Protein backbone atom coordinates (compact mmCIF):
# COMPACT_ATOMS: atom_id res chain seq x y z
CA UNK A 1 0.00 0.00 0.00
CA UNK A 2 2.09 2.91 -1.31
CA UNK A 3 -0.05 5.77 0.08
CA UNK A 4 -1.74 5.05 3.41
CA UNK A 5 -4.27 7.88 3.72
CA UNK A 6 -6.79 9.00 6.36
CA UNK A 7 -10.35 10.35 6.08
CA UNK A 8 -12.02 11.78 9.20
CA UNK A 9 -15.66 12.83 9.66
CA UNK A 10 -18.23 13.71 12.32
CA UNK A 11 -20.88 11.27 11.12
CA UNK A 12 -21.15 7.80 12.61
CA UNK A 13 -20.85 4.37 11.03
CA UNK A 14 -24.59 4.02 10.30
CA UNK A 15 -24.83 7.34 8.43
CA UNK A 16 -25.21 7.94 4.69
CA UNK A 17 -22.00 9.98 4.82
CA UNK A 18 -20.09 6.97 6.10
CA UNK A 19 -21.50 4.69 3.41
CA UNK A 20 -20.50 7.23 0.74
CA UNK A 21 -17.00 7.44 2.17
CA UNK A 22 -16.79 3.64 2.18
CA UNK A 23 -17.60 3.69 -1.54
CA UNK A 24 -14.94 6.39 -2.04
CA UNK A 25 -12.30 4.32 -0.24
CA UNK A 26 -13.24 1.15 -2.12
CA UNK A 27 -13.24 2.94 -5.47
CA UNK A 28 -9.82 4.53 -4.88
CA UNK A 29 -8.31 1.22 -3.76
CA UNK A 30 -9.60 -0.63 -6.83
CA UNK A 31 -8.95 2.03 -9.49
CA UNK A 32 -5.43 2.68 -8.17
CA UNK A 33 -4.53 -1.02 -8.19
CA UNK A 34 -4.02 -0.97 -4.42
CA UNK A 35 -1.52 1.89 -4.50
CA UNK A 36 -3.77 4.01 -2.27
CA UNK A 37 -5.56 2.74 0.85
CA UNK A 38 -7.97 5.05 2.66
CA UNK A 39 -8.72 4.49 6.37
CA UNK A 40 -11.93 5.98 7.82
CA UNK A 41 -12.08 7.78 11.19
CA UNK A 42 -15.77 8.46 12.02
CA UNK A 43 -17.61 10.06 14.92
CA UNK A 44 -15.03 12.81 15.41
CA UNK A 45 -12.34 10.40 16.57
CA UNK A 46 -9.67 12.77 15.23
CA UNK A 47 -11.31 15.97 16.49
CA UNK A 48 -14.27 18.17 15.57
CA UNK A 49 -14.55 19.70 12.11
CA UNK A 50 -12.45 22.76 13.12
CA UNK A 51 -9.63 20.45 14.22
CA UNK A 52 -9.95 18.24 11.14
CA UNK A 53 -9.82 21.22 8.75
CA UNK A 54 -6.69 22.39 10.58
CA UNK A 55 -5.08 18.97 10.10
CA UNK A 56 -5.77 19.02 6.35
CA UNK A 57 -3.97 22.35 6.23
CA UNK A 58 -0.81 20.92 7.81
CA UNK A 59 -0.99 17.68 5.79
CA UNK A 60 -1.51 15.55 8.92
CA UNK A 61 -4.87 14.24 7.71
CA UNK A 62 -5.67 13.65 4.05
CA UNK A 63 -9.47 13.91 3.64
CA UNK A 64 -12.54 15.22 5.47
CA UNK A 65 -16.15 16.36 5.08
CA UNK A 66 -17.45 19.88 5.66
CA UNK A 67 -20.57 21.89 4.82
CA UNK A 68 -20.17 24.97 2.64
CA UNK A 69 -21.79 26.96 5.45
CA UNK A 70 -19.08 25.89 7.92
CA UNK A 71 -16.60 28.25 6.28
CA UNK A 72 -18.50 31.07 8.03
CA UNK A 73 -16.01 30.31 10.78
CA UNK A 74 -13.35 31.96 8.59
CA UNK A 75 -15.31 34.00 6.01
CA UNK A 76 -18.55 35.48 7.50
CA UNK A 77 -20.27 35.84 4.12
CA UNK A 78 -20.35 32.04 3.79
CA UNK A 79 -23.15 31.96 6.35
CA UNK A 80 -25.29 32.76 3.31
CA UNK A 81 -25.35 29.04 2.48
CA UNK A 82 -27.28 28.16 5.67
CA UNK A 83 -29.36 31.30 6.17
CA UNK A 84 -32.75 29.71 6.92
CA UNK A 85 -35.10 29.62 3.95
CA UNK A 86 -32.66 31.33 1.53
CA UNK A 87 -31.30 28.33 -0.37
CA UNK A 88 -34.55 26.77 -1.52
CA UNK A 89 -33.06 23.62 -3.10
CA UNK A 90 -29.94 21.65 -4.06
CA UNK A 91 -29.57 22.99 -7.62
CA UNK A 92 -29.19 26.41 -5.97
CA UNK A 93 -26.60 25.22 -3.46
CA UNK A 94 -24.57 23.89 -6.41
CA UNK A 95 -24.79 27.14 -8.41
CA UNK A 96 -24.18 29.33 -5.34
CA UNK A 97 -20.87 27.56 -4.74
CA UNK A 98 -19.73 26.92 -8.33
CA UNK A 99 -21.34 29.58 -10.55
CA UNK A 100 -21.19 32.82 -8.53
CA UNK A 101 -18.25 35.20 -8.16
CA UNK A 102 -18.53 34.81 -4.39
CA UNK A 103 -18.44 31.02 -4.64
CA UNK A 104 -15.49 30.88 -7.03
CA UNK A 105 -13.55 33.20 -4.73
CA UNK A 106 -14.38 31.09 -1.68
CA UNK A 107 -12.99 27.96 -3.37
CA UNK A 108 -9.80 29.90 -4.16
CA UNK A 109 -9.36 31.01 -0.53
CA UNK A 110 -10.06 27.47 0.69
CA UNK A 111 -6.92 26.53 -1.23
CA UNK A 112 -4.67 29.61 -0.90
CA UNK A 113 -5.44 30.39 2.74
CA UNK A 114 -6.68 27.09 4.22
CA UNK A 115 -4.78 24.36 2.32
CA UNK A 116 -7.94 22.62 1.13
CA UNK A 117 -8.82 21.24 -2.28
CA UNK A 118 -12.47 20.77 -3.22
CA UNK A 119 -13.06 17.50 -5.11
CA UNK A 120 -16.86 17.36 -5.11
CA UNK A 121 -20.14 18.45 -3.54
CA UNK A 122 -23.07 16.31 -2.37
CA UNK A 123 -26.62 16.83 -1.11
CA UNK A 124 -26.83 16.07 2.64
CA UNK A 125 -30.56 16.49 3.35
CA UNK A 126 -32.96 19.25 4.29
CA UNK A 127 -33.11 19.94 8.04
CA UNK A 128 -36.35 19.20 9.92
CA UNK A 129 -37.45 19.75 13.54
CA UNK A 130 -38.22 16.94 16.01
CA UNK A 131 -39.91 17.49 19.40
CA UNK A 132 -41.64 16.06 22.48
CA UNK A 133 -44.64 18.29 21.61
CA UNK A 134 -46.50 19.01 18.37
CA UNK A 135 -45.39 21.92 16.24
CA UNK A 136 -48.55 22.84 14.30
CA UNK A 137 -47.50 26.47 13.87
CA UNK A 138 -44.68 28.84 14.73
CA UNK A 139 -46.51 29.64 17.99
CA UNK A 140 -45.66 26.15 19.33
CA UNK A 141 -41.91 26.88 19.05
CA UNK A 142 -42.14 29.47 21.85
CA UNK A 143 -39.92 28.27 24.70
CA UNK A 144 -39.09 24.97 23.01
CA UNK A 145 -35.68 23.95 24.34
CA UNK A 146 -34.19 23.12 20.95
CA UNK A 147 -30.83 21.43 20.67
CA UNK A 148 -28.58 22.87 17.95
CA UNK A 149 -24.95 22.36 16.83
CA UNK A 150 -22.68 25.22 17.85
CA UNK A 151 -22.96 27.09 14.55
CA UNK A 152 -24.35 30.62 14.25
CA UNK A 153 -26.90 29.83 11.52
CA UNK A 154 -28.55 26.96 13.47
CA UNK A 155 -28.54 29.07 16.64
CA UNK A 156 -30.28 31.81 14.66
CA UNK A 157 -32.96 29.43 13.35
CA UNK A 158 -33.83 28.56 16.94
CA UNK A 159 -33.61 32.09 18.29
CA UNK A 160 -35.64 33.89 15.61
CA UNK A 161 -38.48 31.36 15.55
CA UNK A 162 -38.89 31.97 19.29
CA UNK A 163 -37.28 28.85 20.76
CA UNK A 164 -34.50 28.55 23.36
CA UNK A 165 -31.38 27.43 21.46
CA UNK A 166 -29.48 24.82 23.46
CA UNK A 167 -26.03 24.12 21.93
CA UNK A 168 -24.95 20.59 22.79
CA UNK A 169 -22.42 17.96 21.72
CA UNK A 170 -23.96 15.49 19.26
CA UNK A 171 -23.01 12.42 21.35
CA UNK A 172 -25.24 13.53 24.23
CA UNK A 173 -28.42 14.43 22.33
CA UNK A 174 -29.99 10.97 22.41
CA UNK A 175 -29.99 10.96 26.22
CA UNK A 176 -31.14 14.57 26.62
CA UNK A 177 -34.17 13.87 24.42
CA UNK A 178 -34.92 10.60 26.23
CA UNK A 179 -34.94 12.33 29.64
CA UNK A 180 -36.68 15.46 28.29
CA UNK A 181 -33.76 17.55 29.50
CA UNK A 182 -34.21 19.19 26.07
CA UNK A 183 -37.46 19.25 24.07
CA UNK A 184 -36.15 18.76 20.51
CA UNK A 185 -33.41 18.91 17.88
CA UNK A 186 -33.08 19.74 14.21
CA UNK A 187 -31.34 17.64 11.59
CA UNK A 188 -32.09 15.95 8.23
CA UNK A 189 -34.34 12.88 8.39
CA UNK A 190 -31.42 10.61 7.54
CA UNK A 191 -29.61 11.73 10.70
CA UNK A 192 -32.78 11.20 12.78
CA UNK A 193 -32.81 7.61 11.56
CA UNK A 194 -29.06 7.09 11.97
CA UNK A 195 -29.09 8.35 15.57
CA UNK A 196 -32.47 6.71 16.26
CA UNK A 197 -33.89 9.97 17.64
CA UNK A 198 -37.27 8.61 16.54
CA UNK A 199 -37.16 6.25 19.52
CA UNK A 200 -37.17 9.27 21.86
CA UNK A 201 -39.18 11.94 19.94
CA UNK A 202 -42.90 11.61 19.37
CA UNK A 203 -43.22 14.47 16.91
CA UNK A 204 -41.65 15.44 13.59
CA UNK A 205 -42.30 18.82 11.95
CA UNK A 206 -41.53 19.59 8.29
CA UNK A 207 -39.89 23.00 8.76
CA UNK A 208 -37.51 22.70 5.77
CA UNK A 209 -35.42 25.41 7.34
CA UNK A 210 -31.90 24.74 6.09
CA UNK A 211 -30.38 22.67 3.27
CA UNK A 212 -27.16 20.75 3.94
CA UNK A 213 -24.45 19.97 1.42
CA UNK A 214 -21.21 18.09 2.02
CA UNK A 215 -17.88 18.95 0.43
CA UNK A 216 -15.37 16.16 -0.25
CA UNK A 217 -12.12 17.86 0.77
CA UNK A 218 -8.50 16.79 0.41
CA UNK A 219 -5.36 18.34 1.87
CA UNK A 220 -3.64 20.36 -0.87
CA UNK A 221 -0.31 19.11 0.45
CA UNK A 222 -1.36 15.46 0.16
CA UNK A 223 -2.93 15.94 -3.27
CA UNK A 224 0.08 17.76 -4.70
CA UNK A 225 2.31 14.91 -3.51
CA UNK A 226 0.28 12.39 -5.53
CA UNK A 227 1.40 11.63 -9.12
CA UNK A 228 -1.01 13.02 -11.73
CA UNK A 229 -2.57 9.63 -12.56
CA UNK A 230 -3.45 9.08 -8.90
CA UNK A 231 -4.83 12.62 -8.70
CA UNK A 232 -7.25 11.65 -11.47
CA UNK A 233 -8.24 8.46 -9.65
CA UNK A 234 -9.05 10.34 -6.43
CA UNK A 235 -10.87 13.12 -8.25
CA UNK A 236 -13.04 10.72 -10.27
CA UNK A 237 -13.82 8.53 -7.24
CA UNK A 238 -14.86 11.62 -5.29
CA UNK A 239 -17.27 12.58 -8.09
CA UNK A 240 -18.70 9.06 -8.15
CA UNK A 241 -19.07 8.96 -4.38
CA UNK A 242 -20.79 12.36 -4.35
CA UNK A 243 -23.39 11.14 -6.85
CA UNK A 244 -24.07 8.14 -4.59
CA UNK A 245 -24.08 10.39 -1.51
CA UNK A 246 -26.70 12.62 -3.10
CA UNK A 247 -28.83 9.67 -4.18
CA UNK A 248 -28.93 8.22 -0.65
CA UNK A 249 -30.41 11.44 0.72
CA UNK A 250 -32.85 11.99 -2.13
CA UNK A 251 -34.16 8.40 -1.99
CA UNK A 252 -34.27 8.49 1.83
CA UNK A 253 -36.40 11.63 1.75
CA UNK A 254 -39.28 9.94 -0.12
CA UNK A 255 -39.49 7.08 2.41
CA UNK A 256 -38.43 8.21 5.83
CA UNK A 257 -41.59 10.08 6.87
CA UNK A 258 -43.53 6.85 6.28
CA UNK A 259 -40.89 4.90 8.20
CA UNK A 260 -41.15 7.22 11.22
CA UNK A 261 -44.95 7.12 11.17
CA UNK A 262 -44.64 3.33 11.18
CA UNK A 263 -42.50 3.69 14.33
CA UNK A 264 -45.14 5.76 16.17
CA UNK A 265 -44.02 9.32 15.28
CA UNK A 266 -46.69 11.98 14.52
CA UNK A 267 -45.77 14.24 11.60
CA UNK A 268 -46.84 17.89 11.26
CA UNK A 269 -46.63 20.31 8.33
CA UNK A 270 -46.71 23.79 9.94
CA UNK A 271 -47.36 26.84 7.74
CA UNK A 272 -43.92 28.07 6.80
CA UNK A 273 -44.76 31.62 5.75
CA UNK A 274 -44.61 32.75 9.47
CA UNK A 275 -41.27 30.90 9.72
CA UNK A 276 -39.89 32.70 6.63
CA UNK A 277 -41.21 36.02 7.94
CA UNK A 278 -39.47 35.41 11.28
CA UNK A 279 -36.12 35.22 9.46
CA UNK A 280 -36.31 38.67 7.83
CA UNK A 281 -34.72 40.32 10.94
CA UNK A 282 -31.97 37.70 10.83
CA UNK A 283 -31.22 38.53 7.16
CA UNK A 284 -30.94 42.13 8.33
CA UNK A 285 -28.42 41.06 10.95
CA UNK A 286 -26.43 39.18 8.33
CA UNK A 287 -26.19 42.34 6.23
CA UNK A 288 -25.38 44.47 9.26
CA UNK A 289 -22.40 42.14 9.79
CA UNK A 290 -21.22 41.55 6.20
CA UNK A 291 -22.04 45.02 4.82
CA UNK A 292 -22.77 46.01 1.22
CA UNK A 293 -20.87 42.94 -0.02
CA UNK A 294 -23.03 40.56 1.99
CA UNK A 295 -26.21 42.25 0.78
CA UNK A 296 -24.97 41.84 -2.81
CA UNK A 297 -24.25 38.12 -2.21
CA UNK A 298 -27.65 37.48 -0.61
CA UNK A 299 -29.44 39.16 -3.53
CA UNK A 300 -27.45 37.11 -6.05
CA UNK A 301 -28.37 33.82 -4.34
CA UNK A 302 -32.03 34.76 -3.98
CA UNK A 303 -31.98 35.61 -7.68
CA UNK A 304 -30.94 32.05 -8.57
CA UNK A 305 -34.01 30.17 -9.81
CA UNK A 306 -33.05 26.49 -10.31
Automatic annotation (TrEMBL):
Coiled coil: none annotated. Its main location: other. One of its GO terms (cellular component) is outer membrane-bounded periplasmic space. N-acetyl-beta-neuraminate binds at residues 67, 127, 147, 187. Keywords: Signal, Transport. InterPro entries: DctP_fam, TRAP_DctP, TRAP_DctP_sf. It is found in: Cell envelope. GO terms for biological process: transmembrane transport. It holds the Pfam family DctP. Belongs to the bacterial solute-binding protein 7 family. NCBIfam families: dctP, TRAP_S1. This is DctP family TRAP transporter solute-binding subunit.
Amino acid sequence: AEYDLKFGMNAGTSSNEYKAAEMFAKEVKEKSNGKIEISLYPSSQLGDDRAMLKQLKDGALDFTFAESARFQLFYPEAAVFALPYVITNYEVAQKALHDTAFGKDLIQKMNKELGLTLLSQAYNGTRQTTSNRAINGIADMKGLKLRVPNAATNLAYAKYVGASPTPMAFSEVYLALQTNSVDGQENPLATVQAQKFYEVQKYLAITNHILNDQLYLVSSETFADLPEDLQKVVKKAAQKAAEYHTKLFVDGEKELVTFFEKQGVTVTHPDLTPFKDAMKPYYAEFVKQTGAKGEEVLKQIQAINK
